[PDB]
Design a protein around this ligand. Structure first.
Ligand SMILES: Cc1c(COc2cc(F)c(CNCC(=O)CC(=O)O)cc2F)cccc1-c1ccc2c(c1)OCCO2
Lengths: 124, 126
């Protein structure tokens, strides 16, 4: 039974830091990239994807442009980690790691962002 | 490119009625049942999980037990139709239809429930 697992379902990160949220899927024999789909979203915003071939930036939500990447060569180890650079207050929320590979599953991850007064005030 | 489509992304239904909400996906003449996964959820509650040509409980959420079914006769037309019988106020919200069939895609559908005072009052107090 194909299952996606997340080692942590809660991250608490500092405004302005970099964040890597881990997401794991089973890979027994050699990874068959042509059969794999990885999709990340947060509250219906397309963050990143890898669809058999590769990544399609055309559908990426503007709030994640040039800040989000998938570590591509960790996919052969069953690792679908999302890296977000320069965390913003709008990055707080519930993320979903959706994977298709000889089955389909997803997991949720909650992200909390701590931020100083100056940053919070501008977002106010 | 594999695409799921919703003819309607908004349903307005009466409390106590039956509702069928639909996602369409492309089927080229013949459905390969072994390849298809259909998953319906509302607010992280599992409603339907169709895998290997059969519906799969007991991952189904208790709120939807015996009230939710996938109309399997529609699948060969590429229609993933969720029927919910005896609609309740707690059925209002955002539904998602997640489909793997070669490719994978998902769509959202918003459901609003109208209800008379007596039904809302019970929902209000519990
Ligand atoms: C729904 C799903 C995805 C969705 O992947 C994507 C979702 C997107 F919106 C997009 C972006 N829009 C699609 C696109 O670029 C062109 C187009 O319009 O077709 C890309 C995805 F890969 C990727 C991987 C697995 C599953 C999935 C499918 C069925 C499931 C399930 C997960 O888990 C629970 C069981 O059922």
């Amino acid at each position: 039974a194909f299952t996606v697992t997340v080692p942590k379902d809660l991250y608490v990160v500092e405004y302005g830091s970099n964040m890597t949220i881990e997401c794991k899927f089973p890979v027994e024999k050699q990874l068959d990239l042509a059969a794999l789909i990885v999709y990340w979203e947060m509250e219906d915003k397309n963050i990143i994807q890898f669809v058999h071939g590769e990544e399609d930036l055309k559908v990426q939500h503007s709030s994640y442009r040039q800040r989000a990447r998938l570590l591509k060569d960790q996919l052969s180890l069953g690792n679908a980690a999302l890296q977000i650079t320069d965390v913003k207050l709008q990055d707080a929320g519930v993320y979903r790691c959706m994977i298709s590979y000889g089955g389909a599953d997803y997991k949720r991850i909650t992200v909390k962002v701590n931020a100083p007064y100056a940053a919070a005030l501008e977002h106010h």
